[PDB]
């Protein structure tokens, strides 16, 4: 109807996406470090 951009939902969606991406990056880094530790590569 006569609806403005709901800034609350937009902010929540952006925050969720950014948090998920940061968590994925950190998890990948930790996983590769743990694998290199276990296999004695570096």
* Residue 28 · residue 20 · CB < 8 Å: no
Q: Which residues contact 36 (CB under 8 A, 6 or more apart)?
A: 42
Residue 18 Cβ, how far from another protein at the closest point, in Å? 9
Kindly state whether residue 40 participates in binding another protein, applying the rule CB under 8 A: no
Kindly state whether residue 22 participates in binding another protein, applying the rule CB under 8 A: no
Residue 7 Cβ, how far from another protein at the closest point, in Å? 9
What tokens does 31 get? 């996983």
Judged by the rule CB under 8 A, the positions of this chain that interact with another protein are 1-6, 10, 13-14, 16-17, 20-21, 24-25, 28, 31-32, 34-35, 38-39
């Amino acid at each position: 109807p006569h609806g403005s951009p709901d800034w609350l939902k937009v902010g929540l969606t952006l925050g969720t996406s950014v948090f998920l991406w940061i968590y994925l990056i950190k998890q990948h880094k930790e996983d590769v470090l743990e694998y290199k530790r276990r296999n004695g590569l570096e």
